[PDB]
Amino acid sequence: KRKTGFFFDERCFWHSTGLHAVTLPVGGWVQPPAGGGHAESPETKRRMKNLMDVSGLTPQLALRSAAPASLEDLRRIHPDSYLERFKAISDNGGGMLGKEAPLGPGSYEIACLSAGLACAAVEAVLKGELDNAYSLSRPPGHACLPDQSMGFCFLANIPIAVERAKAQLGLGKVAIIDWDVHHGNGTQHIYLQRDDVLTISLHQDGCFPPGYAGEDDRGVGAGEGYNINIPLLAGAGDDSWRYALETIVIPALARFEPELIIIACGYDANAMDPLARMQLHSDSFRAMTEQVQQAADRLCGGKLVMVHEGGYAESYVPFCGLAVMEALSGIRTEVQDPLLEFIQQQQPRATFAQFQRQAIDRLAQQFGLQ
Amino acid sequence: KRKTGFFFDERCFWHSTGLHAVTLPVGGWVQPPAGGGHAESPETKRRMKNLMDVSGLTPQLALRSAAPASLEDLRRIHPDSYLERFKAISDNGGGMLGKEAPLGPGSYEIACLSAGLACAAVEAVLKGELDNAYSLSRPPGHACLPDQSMGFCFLANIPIAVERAKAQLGLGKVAIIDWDVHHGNGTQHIYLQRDDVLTISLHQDGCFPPGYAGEDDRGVGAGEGYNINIPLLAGAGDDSWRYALETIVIPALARFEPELIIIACGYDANAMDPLARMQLHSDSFRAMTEQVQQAADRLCGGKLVMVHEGGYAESYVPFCGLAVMEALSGIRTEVQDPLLEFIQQQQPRATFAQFQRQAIDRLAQQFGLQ
Amino acid sequence: KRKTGFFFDERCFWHSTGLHAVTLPVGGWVQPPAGGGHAESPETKRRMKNLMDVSGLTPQLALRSAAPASLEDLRRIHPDSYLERFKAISDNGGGMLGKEAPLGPGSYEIACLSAGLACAAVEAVLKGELDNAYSLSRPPGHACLPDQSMGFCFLANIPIAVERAKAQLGLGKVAIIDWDVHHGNGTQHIYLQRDDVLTISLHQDGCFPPGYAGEDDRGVGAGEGYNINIPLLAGAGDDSWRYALETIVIPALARFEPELIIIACGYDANAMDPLARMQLHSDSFRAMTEQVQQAADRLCGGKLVMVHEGGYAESYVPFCGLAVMEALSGIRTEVQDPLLEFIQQQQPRATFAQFQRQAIDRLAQQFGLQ
Amino acid sequence: KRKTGFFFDERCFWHSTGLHAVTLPVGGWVQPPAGGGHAESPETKRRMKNLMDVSGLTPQLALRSAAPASLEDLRRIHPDSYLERFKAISDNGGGMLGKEAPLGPGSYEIACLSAGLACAAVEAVLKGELDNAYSLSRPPGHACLPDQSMGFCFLANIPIAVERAKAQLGLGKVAIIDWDVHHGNGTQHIYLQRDDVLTISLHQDGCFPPGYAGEDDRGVGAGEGYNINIPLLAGAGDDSWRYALETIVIPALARFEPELIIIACGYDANAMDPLARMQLHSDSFRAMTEQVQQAADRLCGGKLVMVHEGGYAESYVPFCGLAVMEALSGIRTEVQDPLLEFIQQQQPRATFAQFQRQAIDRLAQQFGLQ
Ligand SMILES: [K+]
Ligand SMILES: [K+]
Ligand SMILES: [K+]
Ligand SMILES: [K+]
Ligand SMILES: [K+]
Ligand SMILES: [K+]
Ligand SMILES: [K+]
Ligand SMILES: [K+]
Ligand SMILES: [Zn+2]
Ligand SMILES: [Zn+2]
Ligand SMILES: [Zn+2]
Ligand SMILES: [Zn+2]
Ligand SMILES: [Zn+2]
Ligand SMILES: [Zn+2]
Ligand SMILES: [Zn+2]
Ligand SMILES: [Zn+2]
């Protein structure tokens, strides 16, 4: 069975964003935290890898790092003025990169590394070195616009990997499925006019970017039909998210026929996340990984790459990423998620569950899938 | 205008619950936090008072502490075996108090103090020393059963205050309205068979206690009709919570005619809370405080007491408690909640908002109010 | 007995210095802290006041805040270009203020406030409103040069207070005694050429500024003889520090005859401090406060002002500041310093103690006091 | 050149000691920390390994874990009643293990693992698999008595490794050199009556155990002459510690002729440590490692094992352990310790340096080495 790669580097846990009280910059009426405030902490991601190690999983994966993405890699997506300006703050120690977007010293080099991990994960899977692969890419990428940092993201990790594979390995169609709980606004924008990449985003209605739902934004020119947004109702849990995958996402894969499936894998839809209002647990992420691995098996030789995005519950995200790596690798450790049964009990009752399914039905109909 | 009391003591910020990774005890597969993990931190509550101070509000309130609740106060609600056992862990340093319930050294004396603050707040308002009053009671109370600690609560702060007022000041009918996002399971239980206290709970369907909704639990014997549960759908925000107050809660007050309204005032329905999935902001809590103050004005001489319960978003709860104290005191500081506009944009769209209103309509009909 | 003022403001705990791993800025080879790294935390100072409150001491003191120091106050010490530049970083959020000196948003206004507390403490004591007084001035002042921030200090808190008293209340001679464990380099510099202020500094040989001892730096022109440095050997404890006070400091007061004694009161000579290597405990600071209060009683009507400087042991400094406030107020709470006996056992044996005394003897002889 | 082993396991960073304000248990007058208080944090040790990784050093070492020490391994040093009692608290979650000694859930299994790492490090070097070796053994061992936990230590890591090597690999004489800044009281006690292990301890006079210096404690019966204590004066720095090694320690090795040298390698003599008052920097530890490696080269085939003990400066210990691993491996990374020059300037002047040398001279004479 499965040779699964896990692309990670200690340096990615060193990127800092300065002083934050959870999401809020310090000053004015925001008192400095006595804690280690700032949701996008290394700890969310490190805890995952630590739990992989202690669970026994890590030795059974193909561990790898990567060379950082080259200047030329970056330029397939981002214009120089943007790259130069992000490099210039990095080389200061700090400043700010336009409205709500702060880094720290050496964030440039670390963001290039984060994007490189994604690049290498894509390549190893495409070449048949690995059956599938995960990339613990920090900082994340899915909100980054070509010319504007957004949502803790500074480079477009997945698009950079994809355009590199398109240029150096003749990658054809590719589907990017984004189950981070925020909209994949950066991916969507980059591929809006293109029919060669299907971009699909499951997200919390109105969460981030705020007030954006997106269901009627289908793509432009040749790209029309090749973008799919699924604005799930805040509050939704396991039944809704899996219904959405099975009723919309997988059929959408079946129709488009990718050579490769990429997950934008955020865990911030988990039931304890401060940055959204969804009720997923470890088994939810386990199942979704199953659904996309199996589609990948039917459609593109099992070729699945997952790239870490968001996730801000420091105690709970590790149980979710473990489950993901377990489904992805085919290997089951002894860890039992200590909150699984508690979150199962918290799930919306049938009235909501049916309302949400109805809504997902109307979207599948709207997108020509039902 | 308003002489508003604010009952607080430094000692309440000293109660500790040991080593937690947010909600999870440390050990097994739960790695020790490098942060200061444990949601029920002093910081959530201290930050509120700190922001009151820097905003200029604090000097314009009547600040008070209190003698702790007496043994005899405690015994109106709790049996000795329970009190003795909680005292015995407190006097050890720690142990545990049955399934998921941990304290620290001296938590007994501090819980007695927390309950005393609530007692004194009730009395000062009843005697006409104060128009209204808030009690920064930590640890909280609303989940505590007579004989079982639950949900970070060790004593039944509000019932202890109420039965003390019933015995020493001839308090008659009283309504307790609980807008902490978890069920007021402890209040409900204590007053289940009684017609002299109306207990009303707005809470997230199935959140805590897990899997409990409660709409058909109306009370027993004489107490039938005198308990009201409102299980709001996870995901709901400002429109829903205020609709619920106006369509169910206030009419329910109007019908029952209390001599006193007490809020169980949790802030964990705020949009960034890790311990629930609701989307309230500072203006939401401001409005709800307005609605209950005005009912209090019409029905019981303006006599409103608020007692702090839950709230786990360290950066955002202070803006919410400020707003509450501002509505309660009648005084508006210069602070503008820096997330207000962002959370407003995140609010559920009209499809959900109408579904939730419909559900609230059917409950008002079920409870004989519409 | 004693009307003791305690000048403090919540705003002083809001000044931030950004992301630090204890003393080290983040980046390069310095990994971001998962803790709340940065020695100059609010917590060191807040913990002191919290322990005063819970000990029962606080209600028995005259609590006060202050108007911030005026622009004109600041200009008696600092040139405009320096003030304008510090104001400009404050109004950015951050930058940096030359070699190793970082602030946060609104640090300007908070530093003005910190200095105002010292100003008001000096005035209240001088006017006979208060017998004596403490100022919890954060950020500290004693390392600040007129035109350069240094050692976490941005304004010269004590000199600003003194020159304001000199200009508005005809203050004559004043002695400033600095038992912060670092050199009072800022005070020394401001008063180097002046005979009207005696500046005395007890400090760790070579600690901060690094490699500075200072014994032969006595003052310039009229100021010659009116500066006294006492470079204590790293490692020294209670016996040494009290010997130094009694053999050098108090006699030096006796000779100069001040109208006022001011302590630069740092606690970083405590035995657990990461920022020096001295072995003082709570009773050490208690005794030193006694020695200077009694000199003040003999020489200037009991007029003693203490102004908080350094101190970086978060768990231990509060016990030390409590002891100080207890000696200063004349009031003994029930708190017993839980480390007192342990640190007493750690004290240097007689060989060192005698070597240190010898060294202090040779300095008293050198300064014409023995 | 050198095949250097580095024995570490993620599980050792999971051992917890509950709620501490640096060294102080929470309760009474000790306020709960808002930080992550408790000096013996995982972070001190993790930061070292993280910096090894980012510096490029780690891939050039032989990384290994180990099976935990067996029950039988443990019993060569510890009696069952002690083992059973420590196991019983571990299996509770917590309690306490006599006067000032707290663990957490699963500390037993993790302490066995920590001791196993030391066992395996000793064996690999003895068998000629590795030239030398380091063991990141957490929790530490050097203060543990057979029947009493002490100083954050629960098992006697180094003695357990040594007696296992004595029983399974015919290990003869061995020298244990302890440059943790606290006395090696546990090692000393275990080997007090024995001539086959030389135990040498450099430590801060009176620090821990408190009030113990130890110079005249030489050993009992056959063990007389085979224990050496060097009580350095609090305050001492690089010149003193290296003088002590060269004038006492190395000659003492030369005389005894071990088959193996073991360092008890604590970093708490570093200049920023809250738990002692010494002024060492990264180059200090680098040099000491050089001196003992070279003795090892002359005397026992280069066979040197180092086992991690104490070290509580979270930002500075990593630079020190890096330097150690660099000297031990023979490999120099690009990292420059950003505090090296600052701490060099802080070093005691010549008067102290000469006083300390004199004291070390008199000890070498007393021990028959000069
Ligand atoms: K998404
Ligand atoms: K597209
Ligand atoms: K409720
Ligand atoms: K009732
Ligand atoms: K000083
Ligand atoms: K002078
Ligand atoms: K030692
Ligand atoms: K021996
Ligand atoms: Zn996200
Ligand atoms: Zn479920
Ligand atoms: Zn709650
Ligand atoms: Zn709204
Ligand atoms: Zn200082
Ligand atoms: Zn002493
Ligand atoms: Zn040590
Ligand atoms: Zn040096």
From TrEMBL, chains A, B, C, D:
- Origin organism is Klebsiella pneumoniae subsp. ozaenae
Out of the domains of life, which is the source?
Bacteria
Q: Name one GO molecular function term.
A: histone deacetylase activity
> Is Metal-binding set as a keyword in this record?
yes
Give its E.C. classification number: 3.5.1.-
Ranges for domain Histone deacetylase: 38-326
UniProt KW keywords: Hydrolase, Metal-binding, Zinc
**Top-level enzyme category:** hydrolase
CDD domains to which the protein is assigned, alphabetical: HDAC_classII_1
Q: What is this protein called?
A: Deacetylase
Picking any one GO biological process from the record gives: epigenetic regulation of gene expression
InterPro entries, A to Z: HDACs, His_deacetylse_dom, His_deacetylse_dom_sf, Ureohydrolase_dom_sf
Q: What are the binding positions for Zn(2+) in this chain? A: 180, 182, 268
Q: Does the keyword Oxidoreductase apply?
A: no
User: Belongs to which family?
Assistant: Belongs to the histone deacetylase family.
